PDB file of C-alpha atoms in Angstrom:
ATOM      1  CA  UNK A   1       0.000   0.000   0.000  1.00  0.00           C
ATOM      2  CA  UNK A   2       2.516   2.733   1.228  1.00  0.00           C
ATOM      3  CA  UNK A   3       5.792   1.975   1.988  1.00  0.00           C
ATOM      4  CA  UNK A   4       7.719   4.843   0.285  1.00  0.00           C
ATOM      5  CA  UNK A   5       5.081   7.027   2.219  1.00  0.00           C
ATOM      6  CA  UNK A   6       5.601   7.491   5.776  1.00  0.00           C
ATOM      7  CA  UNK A   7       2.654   9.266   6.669  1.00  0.00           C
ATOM      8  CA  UNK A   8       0.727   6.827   4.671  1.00  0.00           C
ATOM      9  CA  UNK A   9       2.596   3.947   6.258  1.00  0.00           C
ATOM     10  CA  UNK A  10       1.901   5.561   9.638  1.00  0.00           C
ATOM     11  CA  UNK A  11      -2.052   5.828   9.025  1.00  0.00           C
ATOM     12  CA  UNK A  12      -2.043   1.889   8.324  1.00  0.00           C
ATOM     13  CA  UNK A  13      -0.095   0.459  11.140  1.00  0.00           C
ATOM     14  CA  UNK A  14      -1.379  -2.899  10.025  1.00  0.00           C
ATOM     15  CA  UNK A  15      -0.278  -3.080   6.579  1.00  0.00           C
ATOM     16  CA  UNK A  16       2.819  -1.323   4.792  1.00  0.00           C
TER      17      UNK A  16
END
């Protein structure tokens, strides 16, 4: 889903 995106990454603690 978002790994190059932190903030992303960070909204989805369950996935990456």
């Amino acid at each position: 889903g978002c790994c190059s995106d932190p903030r992303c990454n960070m909204n989805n603690p369950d996935y990456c």
